[PDB]
Amino acid sequence: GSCKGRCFELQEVGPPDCRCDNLCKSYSSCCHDFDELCLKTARGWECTKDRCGEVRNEENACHCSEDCLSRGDCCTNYQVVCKGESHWVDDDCEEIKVPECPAGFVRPPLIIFSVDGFRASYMKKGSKVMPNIEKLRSCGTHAPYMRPVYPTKTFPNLYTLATGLYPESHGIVGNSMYDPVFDASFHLRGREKFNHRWWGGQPLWITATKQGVRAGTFFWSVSIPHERRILTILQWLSLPDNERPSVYAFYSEQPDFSGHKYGPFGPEMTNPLREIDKTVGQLMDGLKQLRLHRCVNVIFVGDHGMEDVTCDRTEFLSNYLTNVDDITLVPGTLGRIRAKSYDPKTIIAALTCKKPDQHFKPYMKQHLPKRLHYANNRRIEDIHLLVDRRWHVARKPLDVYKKPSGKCFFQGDHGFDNKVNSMQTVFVGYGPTFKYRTKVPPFENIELYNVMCDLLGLKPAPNNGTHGSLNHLLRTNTFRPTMPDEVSRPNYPGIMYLQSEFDLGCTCDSTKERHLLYGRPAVLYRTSYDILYHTDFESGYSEIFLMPLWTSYTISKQAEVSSIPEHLTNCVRPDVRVSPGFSQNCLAYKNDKQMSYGFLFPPYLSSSPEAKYDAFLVTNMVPMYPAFKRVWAYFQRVLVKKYASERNGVNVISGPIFDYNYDGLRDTEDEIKQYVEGSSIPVPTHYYSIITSCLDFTQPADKCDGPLSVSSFILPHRPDNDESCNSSEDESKWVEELMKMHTARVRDIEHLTGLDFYRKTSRSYSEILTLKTYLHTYE
Ligand SMILES: *[C@@H]1O[C@H](CO)[C@@H](O[C@@H]2O[C@H](CO)[C@@H](O[C@@H]3O[C@H](CO[C@H]4O[C@H](CO[C@H]5O[C@H](CO)[C@@H](O)[C@H](O)[C@@H]5O)[C@@H](O)[C@H](O)[C@@H]4O)[C@@H](O)[C@H](O)[C@@H]3O)[C@H](O)[C@H]2NC(C)=O)[C@H](O)[C@H]1NC(C)=O
Ligand SMILES: CN(c1nc(-c2ccc(F)cc2)cs1)c1c(CCCNC(=O)c2ccc3[nH]c(=O)oc3c2)nc2ccc(C3CCN(S(C)(=O)=O)CC3)nn12
Ligand SMILES: [Ca+2]
Ligand SMILES: [Zn+2]
Ligand SMILES: [Zn+2]
């Protein structure tokens, strides 16, 4: 068989027929004439003045004979060089107010141009280096940066872009992985990447296909040059409407490859950036030549950035563990440890706060910051090392390969925590469905799959994006988000019980408007809970979990911090609105030698000696380890008031999270694995707070007319502070840094609590969704 008239065919052939498709050279074979017919290289990829009107030679990679338009095989710059047309980049931008597409185009095509290792800061280079990219950016919709997923590696991020899912959900949790159910390893080298068993979720090309939208093959054999890929995309675009794809992908391994070699700031980086820009120019000139340049939506997107990393900055596990022969380490900009064929508790202890400058931190995966969403997959090893930016971790010195000079082969790497600035990457949308010359706030790459679906008129598969949160990127929104329905209505108990009906072993001697600024959270699961009002705070008290799901209070800029009278030490009061049978009891805490308790509304911030008594109600009490109380006390005593001063008032919503199975979702009763001893009082795995104020800080938090400003955290409820290497010191030296490490989105808290916040504002729901997906990152 021949490839004549079949080069890079889209439709599937059977095993027996010889292949002519994008991947036929990858661990496979093509028709014998595939190279001759489909991989022409003669005379390169650019028309020159001397080639214009050349006699046609069928060996040429592309053609500059005048028949090339009718044959569909011009070089992308043919009309520029030979017919006096301008390069696309030399045309001033004009708003694409409507798609300018041929008849038979049911929708604008989507072309996804992904670049590997493209730091957000490279856009600083400007038209000097990247004129085509600069035009897309300045004339289209762009963000200052896009946040990748952790780990900030290629395959996890590419497949996240494709599926809208966290790595833990789509299954590509690294560039290297071991799956203990397969008992098999995944690597980038070799053929495992082609085995479908690794890839979960539903990538865009499958979503497209299943809904009758035709996809261009997203994948190319490594031997097929970039320029051939661009020409193929353009040729596919000229197919008749019954064969033409609506979505296309081009991927470049640059600037990542050069980034590793020369580091992100090396003078050698200019050249690769120029070459990427040339490739964009080829695509745009090609589209213009097809008159599709005001028809197609283009996304220019990176998977991650690039950090300065040299092998002199390597931590070795063998400086911490005497026996390293019994462990397998996935090394580099992150660490994952498992047994080679060993005790995890011993390993963690041996790796914890051992050296003053220690450039990694060990974790059990369930204790990693929840914002990373990196635990709920069997391919993620229990033991994880978060590596400091600019560093590597390795097993022993001999695993590092140095030149004779001592210098290493690499000066850049990536993979670090996705909060790190050097890991941030790029997003640009250009075309009729994107806004014109519009800057949008930074966002997470998990959100893009929904956008790409909307651009193609596809119903997205279930994913971790928040559908509607990027509506502000698009001219026209086919999807309009709706606020979810409240599932459980609250009770509003009055005074129902006598003091004397309580045997809890405890001893002691406008609310809405000012404390719930954005409406009551909605409970989106089936349960029984009560709204409890007080002078200084409001709560939604769970009769199932015997504590608030949420506690809401406002602290003005002028609010005063007080201390507890000695007599109120150990004070807990029964709540006459809540049944003894649905209350905590103090005996459980007395008998649980490991467990103490804290309060969601702090007595410290009571508005009067009288009101302070409300804070000591059993319904405001939550189980807290002594170690964690050090964190919580400092947050409540010092930080809340600091934030109120700095932000001109703050509204605080705090509560427990239960995630014993570390899936990032609210546990049901049955999934709770720890209770206060001898009681039905469940122990939170985490405690959250959402801190809201006016974006315009000249306005107080309770009188805000415009956009809101939020910061949130999900603190691990740990019986120790081993995570914080300075925790032997005053809380002023370490608690706030701990909190910043555990920063979160409101959305993260919503998943973990089954609550919906901000249901009553003066803001559009679309805008609220962006607020909920916002992540305040620090350091
Ligand atoms: C991020 O977004 C994902 C996708 O929406 C969320 O994951 C889903 O979580 C729900 C609720 O827990 C799951 O729903 C259940 O689905 C049952 C149907 O079976 C389907 O399960 C397979 C599992 O998916 C893969 O992903 C996990 C990830 O760890 C792998 O371990 C698995 O091996 C799979 O490869 C599906 O692929 C398949 O279609 C099955 O039909 C149903 O019977 C239950 O009643 C329940 O509804 C759902 O399975 C999850 N889907 C995916 C793709 O993971 C995830 O919670 C979100 N995370 C956060 C933090 O919000
Ligand atoms: C994952 N992947 C690709 N993804 C896209 C993509 C994703 C989203 C989107 F919106 C548009 C396109 C295109 S190709 C992919 C790749 C590319 C990897 C090449 N680069 C490297 O090897 C690389 C680069 C930099 C690195 N830095 C570093 O440390 O390591 C690096 C490596 N190659 C492949 C091969 C196979 C596949 C699978 C094929 C099967 N399908 S499925 C089951 O859906 O049919 C899944 C994907 N993807 N792939
Ligand atoms: Ca859970
Ligand atoms: Zn990459
Ligand atoms: Zn790389």
Curated annotation (Swiss-Prot):
Its main location: secreted. Gene3D superfamilies: 4.10.410.20, Alkaline Phosphatase, subunit A, Extracellular Endonuclease, subunit A. InterPro entries: Alkaline_phosphatase_core_sf (IPR017850), DNA/RNA_non-sp_Endonuclease_sf (IPR044929), Endo_G_ENPP1-like_dom (IPR001604), ENPP1-3/EXOG-like_nuc-like (IPR020821), His-Me_finger_sf (IPR044925), Phosphodiest/P_Trfase (IPR002591), SMB_chordata (IPR020436), Somatomedin_B-like_dom_sf (IPR036024). It is found in: Secreted. Inhibited by vanadate. Inhibited by micromolar levels of bile salts, such as tauroursodeoxycholate. Not inhibited by taurodeoxycholate. Not inhibited by hydroxysterols, such as 7-hydroxycholesterol, testosterone, dexamethasone and prednisolone. Inhibited by EDTA and EGTA. Disulfide bonds join C3-C20, C7-C38, C18-C31, C24-C30, C47-C64, C52-C82, C62-C75, C68-C74, C93-C139, C101-C295, C311-C408, C353-C725, C506-C586, C508-C571, C694-C704. Zn(2+) 2 binds at D256, H260, H414. The keyword Hydrolase applies. It catalyses: a 1-O-alkyl-sn-glycero-3-phosphoethanolamine + H2O = a 1-O-alkyl-sn-glycero-3-phosphate + ethanolamine + H(+); a 1-acyl-sn-glycero-3-phosphoethanolamine + H2O = a 1-acyl-sn-glycero-3-phosphate + ethanolamine + H(+); 1-(9Z-octadecenoyl)-sn-glycero-3-phosphoethanolamine + H2O = 1-(9Z-octadecenoyl)-sn-glycero-3-phosphate + ethanolamine + H(+); a 1-O-alkyl-sn-glycero-3-phosphocholine + H2O = a 1-O-alkyl-sn-glycero-3-phosphate + choline + H(+). Changing T154S: 15% of wild-type lysophospholipase D activity. The nuclease-like domain is most probably catalytically inactive as residues that are essential for catalysis in the DNA/RNA non-specific endonucleases are not conserved. However, it is required for the stability of the protein and the catalytic activity born by the Phosphodiesterase domain. This is Autotaxin.
